[PDB]
Design a protein around this ligand. Structure first.
Ligand code: 6L0
Ligand code: CL
Ligand code: FE
Length: 274
């Protein structure tokens, strides 16, 4: 049995195995963390399958939704990992031990060391975290030599017809930009976005929320066309200066180590080349 330590936002259902052999991940947030710790994933989510970086590592996993109870049963999990807003966690715990995680109670780094403790893989957690810290510290110096230490970044996302701003800890590059590289956001983003983590926003007020640089996640090229062509958008200084960094949401949605490795390199390159 896993020691099952008390962790903010972690709820255990049933007896978590010390060394799980057959894991179903129903929360894309965590899939890549489990992969980093070399857990055997036999089920993953549709978002995991559409993540081109993570998808390479879980080709053998079946795509399942939380509601696919018969499919999850057939996979014979000894562990299921879910997000706490899932509506059927009671049904899932009847199939196998479940770890339920409430988002953001622990930070993107702490989540790894937490799993390290649950699964007795502190060694792999520690190793990755040490190297992440070193690498991020070095890359921070490189990007800030180009942007200046006080350059502001805004994280944004396009989803269907809606526009969002994100904070330090809701994916879309925020973890890297705001935590790993310690970039400030514009005052209005700190004030209206950081607490909630995300904010749905009219395109008309975007100029007020963008300073030196903006990172934009979208699932494809076409989604933002109208925005980018618009007078208002092209009036934005950061836009006028080609300080816009367009990234692939299919990977940038994520906060896991595997996804972040790609995001780090991508953002380093985009900033250095600005
Ligand atoms: O967990 C993360 C980063 C934070 C995040 O987005 N989460 O959903 C974490 C769990 C949040 C608690 C549940 N809240 C909701 O499900 C409300 C909708 C939601 O997912 N949000 O992220 C809120 C703002 C975004 C709404 C637009 N939808 C998307 O961007 C789809 C990707 C989207 O937002 N997803 O959550 C699906 C893919 C996520 C890949 C892993 N990334
Ligand atoms: Cl990208
Ligand atoms: Fe989300």
């Amino acid at each position: 049995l896993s020691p099952m330590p008390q962790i903010a936002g972690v709820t255990y259902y049933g007896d978590i195995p010390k060394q799980p052999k057959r894991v179903v991940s129903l929360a894309s947030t965590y899939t890549g963390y489990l992969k980093k710790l070399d857990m055997n994933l036999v089920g993953v989510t549709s978002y995991d399958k559409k993540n081109p970086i993570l998808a390479k590592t879980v080709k053998k996993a079946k795509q399942v939704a939380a509601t696919d109870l018969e499919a999850i049963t057939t996979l014979k999990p000894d562990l299921i990992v879910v997000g706490s807003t899932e509506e059927n966690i009671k049904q899932l715990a009847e199939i196998a031990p479940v770890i339920s995680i409430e988002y953001r109670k622990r930070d993107y780094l702490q989540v790894l060391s937490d799993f390290g403790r649950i699964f007795n893989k502190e060694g792999k957690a520690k190793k990755w975290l040490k190297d992440w810290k070193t690498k991020t510290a070095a890359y921070e110096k490189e990007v800030k030599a180009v942007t200046g230490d006080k350059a502001t970044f805004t994280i944004m996302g396009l989803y269907e017809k809606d526009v969002y701003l994100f904070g330090k800890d809701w994916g879309r590059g925020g973890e890297i930009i705001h935590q790993a590289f310690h970039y400030d956001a514009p005052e209005k983003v700190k004030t209206e976005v950081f607490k909630q983590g995300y904010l749905s926003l009219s395109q008309e007020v975007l100029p007020d929320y963008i300073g030196d640089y903006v990172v934009i996640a979208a699932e494809d090229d076409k989604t933002g066309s109208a925005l980018y062509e618009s007078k208002l958008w092209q009036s934005i200084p950061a836009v006028k200066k080609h300080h816009v960094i367009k990234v692939n949401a299919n990977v940038f949605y994520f906060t896991d180590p595997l996804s972040l490795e790609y995001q780090l390199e991508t953002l380093r390159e985009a900033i250095l080349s600005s």
